[PDB]
From Swiss-Prot, chains A, B, C:
Positions carrying Phosphothreonine: 74
Protein name: 2-iminobutanoate/2-iminopropanoate deaminase
Entry's EC annotation: 3.5.99.10, 3.1.-.-
Keywords, alphabetical: Acetylation, Cytoplasm, Hydrolase, Lipid metabolism, Mitochondrion, Nucleus, Peroxisome, Phosphoprotein, RNA-binding
Tissues showing expression: Expressed by various malignant neoplasms.
Length: 135, 135, 135
């Protein structure tokens, strides 16, 4: 069979790994992006201000990883939004909507028991490397 | 590179979006289906009767989304079953089994802290558009 | 369109199914592996010793499923690590690192409310059937 391209995506514009994972893996045309917390890329510390600020930073981090792979938010096809508190659903929704301005991904959003570093939100994503033709 | 097909799947036979997501995204041949709660498509209210009734409605909803994409349950390759209570595992298993009557998908099933709308179960799925040849 | 290969992966070297799922599904070149607990393949009982021993057994189980599909850990592109306790993150990380000795997968790791069988850890994975060419 054909040898499919598998590339580790890595950018200093997103946080360093806090463990045994890659920021994202591109395989064939699919990009699996690791769960992102609202961590500042330079410090690796959660940004202050709680879930809204954290959600913004997490999505900014995903954006930088997408850019490293020659993609943007239009390439995302599935997202998972993990919350520390289900009462934050509406607030996070309003943040998320600002990044996906068409062809909204499939998703799931729900509350887990706890995230690393005491994070209030973690977002995972799957993207597909372009070009994509959307009818 | 080739421009891959990316299509938003949308049917009025499944619940309207309660937020910034598509019911499903078809990209190349893979269909990412959003997490479905046991919501009535017409009202958008959770069906009464608790987890068993909700599980049935959620799977019915996935079925309608699959149909919109020219697929059925035989096309599902991976499911995720999110529970509000791990004690409901056996009950949900018995519901789920009635929809997948061969070539059972890969899966994960476990308890989360909370689902949207106070749901007792949420099911996500990945399918692949046919034809599929199963040896 | 072409008829894509869909194959159920099954090995007696990994635990029997405790419900309506396949150990893994290969579709085209992507392998979706079901969530694995730290269950002994012969008995179907969780191994003693808590999360570290369970994590080792779960990863051993994934390894046997990969082998059945003609793959190994180098083929894994995304993992999900579900914990019963976020305080176990560092311990599980140290176990996991021993299995992935290059080209680390994308991942997400976090605490859920409860796993089947009172498990302390469950690991899901996505792999891509080789050959893969890593630059």
């Amino acid at each position: 069979m054909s040898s499919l391209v598998r590339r580790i995506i890595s950018t200093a514009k997103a946080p360093a790994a806090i463990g045994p994972y890659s920021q994202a893996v591109l395989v064939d045309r699919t990009i699996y992006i690791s769960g992102q917390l609202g961590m500042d890329p330079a410090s690796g510390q959660l940004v202050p201000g709680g879930v809204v600020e954290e959600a913004k930073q997490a999505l900014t981090n995903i954006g930088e990883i997408l850019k490293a792979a020659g993609c943007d938010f239009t390439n995302v096809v599935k997202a998972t939004v993990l919350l520390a508190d289900i009462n934050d659903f509406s607030a996070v929704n309003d943040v998320y909507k600002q990044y996906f301005q068409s062809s909204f991904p499939a998703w799931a959003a729900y509350q887990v028991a706890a995230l690393p570093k005491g994070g209030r939100v973690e977002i995972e994503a799957i993207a597909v490397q372009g070009p994509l033709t959307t009818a």
